[PDB]
Amino acid sequence: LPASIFRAYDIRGVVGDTLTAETAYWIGRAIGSESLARGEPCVAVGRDGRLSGPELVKQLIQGLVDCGCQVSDVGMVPTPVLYYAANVLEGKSGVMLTGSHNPPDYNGFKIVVAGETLANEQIQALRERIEKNDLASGVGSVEQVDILPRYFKQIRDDIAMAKPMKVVVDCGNGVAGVIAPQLIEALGCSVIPLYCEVDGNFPNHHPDPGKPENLKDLIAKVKAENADLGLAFDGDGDRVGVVTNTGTIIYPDRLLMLFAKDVVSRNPGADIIFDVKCTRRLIALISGYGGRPVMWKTGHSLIKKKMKETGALLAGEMSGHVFFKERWFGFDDGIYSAARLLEILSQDQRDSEHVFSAFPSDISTPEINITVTEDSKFAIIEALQRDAQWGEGNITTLDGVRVDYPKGWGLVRASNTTPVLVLRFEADTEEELERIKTVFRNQLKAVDSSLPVPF
Numbered sequence: 001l002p003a004s005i006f007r008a009y010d011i012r013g014v015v016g017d018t019l020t021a022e023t024a025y026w027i028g029r030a031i032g033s034e035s036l037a038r039g040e041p042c043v044a045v046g047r048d049g050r051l052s053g054p055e056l057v058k059q060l061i062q063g064l065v066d067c068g069c070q071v072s073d074v075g076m077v078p079t080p081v082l083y084y085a086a087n088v089l090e091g092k093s094g095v096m097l098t099g100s101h102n103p104p105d106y107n108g109f110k111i112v113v114a115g116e117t118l119a120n121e122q123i124q125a126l127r128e129r130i131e132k133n134d135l136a137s138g139v140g141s142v143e144q145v146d147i148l149p150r151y152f153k154q155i156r157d158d159i160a161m162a163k164p165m166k167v168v169v170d171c172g173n174g175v176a177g178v179i180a181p182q183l184i185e186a187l188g189c190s191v192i193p194l195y196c197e198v199d200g201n202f203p204n205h206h207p208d209p210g211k212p213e214n215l216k217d218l219i220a221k222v223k224a225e226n227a228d229l230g231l232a233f234d235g236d237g238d239r240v241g242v243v244t245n246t247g248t249i250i251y252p253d254r255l256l257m258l259f260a261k262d263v264v265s266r267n268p269g270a271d272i273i274f275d276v277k278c279t280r281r282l283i284a285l286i287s288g289y290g291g292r293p294v295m296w297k298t299g300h301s302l303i304k305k306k307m308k309e310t311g312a313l314l315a316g317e318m319s320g321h322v323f324f325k326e327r328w329f330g331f332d333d334g335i336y337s338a339a340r341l342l343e344i345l346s347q348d349q350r351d352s353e354h355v356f357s358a359f360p361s362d363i364s365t366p367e368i369n370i371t372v373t374e375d376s377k378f379a380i381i382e383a384l385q386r387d388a389q390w391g392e393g394n395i396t397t398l399d400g401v402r403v404d405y406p407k408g409w410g411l412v413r414a415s416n417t418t419p420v421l422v423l424r425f426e427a428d429t430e431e432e433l434e435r436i437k438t439v440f441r442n443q444l445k446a447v448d449s450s451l452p453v454p455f
């Protein structure tokens, strides 16, 4: 197996190129062996609506079975529904066969062993098990398990909408179309579906609500139908995008402001986690409500680990991953988060635009990307962490370098999916935004004067 598919948060391949049926078998063997090493013979297995799903999942299942594992086959489900399985069934282990928000040929594996979502050296450990042949051998089993109807009822019975709402739902031809418009309707909503047919070809737009062009269709539909809200889901349903009645894109860091208020009001002193890509305004808002704001690393697995470590009741990422522990299980779930958004918005007399514009805004840049190399990106960060001068600010190095100034903040960190440096800037003024960009541009040039800085 190529070593590049083994990533910080999970396993990510290109089927035919870097991922084959055989490697999915061996990944299955490795995961069963880790589960058994942690005392867990029971593993749930789910797959998204990708074309290579049926081919690779039988291989994954066979790998696990060949360890002596008792496999619970949940079939085709959103990612969070797999996580739900590994919470409500016998076992605390689970593998999701998905290629997230990526183009059709991509697939991969999100992995939970004995309650813990694997990351960093644990993903690598799986690869090393195969190379070493440190693998269990046994005669496992496979039980068919229809889990979706139970997930559905779990949400419906806990969500209490105060008024009817009309919602455009965009599933981008991903697997959220298996449940999202159905469930949202059951909550007491009228749903206008967009691209809700599961088609692994993605003939319309890539199922990636993180990009604004993938929300064009949703925004027009909201306005055209006088819908109260628009919602978008990514390929596997662990990310949510939010649009207002007037077509305003609500980024997940401002979405997390509304949730934090909500969660913290029933839970004084609750720890609330956000990633380093999120507005500094979250810190203030969380503290304002008597919450404890915990800034952490980008990446779903790192966040979930952080939640168990801190006992946080809620977490959010700038990518669209939102993790509810309160009234839930603590995994990222775009579908459950949507449900929590709708409950809160239905309890208010104002429209979604005005609910969200009540909160403070700063001049914000879009996430910036500089392509470097896989063998340079961490070294650039380390050089910046060793050598860089930022002036007066609060310097955070937990993930790249973030510096919070009184009137804004800048960030630079290495992606864990691509050979890129990821940057973000926020400020009160254009003047201050430029000052911070110039600070960061000069620190990057000082590490490598040939670095292409587009700010």
Ligand SMILES: O=P(O)(O)O[C@H]1O[C@H](CO)[C@@H](O)[C@H]1O
Pocket: 009, 298, 299, 300, 317, 319, 414, 415, 416, 417, 418, 422
């Ligand atoms: O900048 P990187 O590390 O590639 O992060 C991207 O990768 C993750 C996908 O799970 C998302 O959290 C997104 O932020």
Ligand SMILES: [Zn+2]
Pocket: 100, 101, 234, 235, 236, 237, 238, 239
């Ligand atoms: Zn996803």
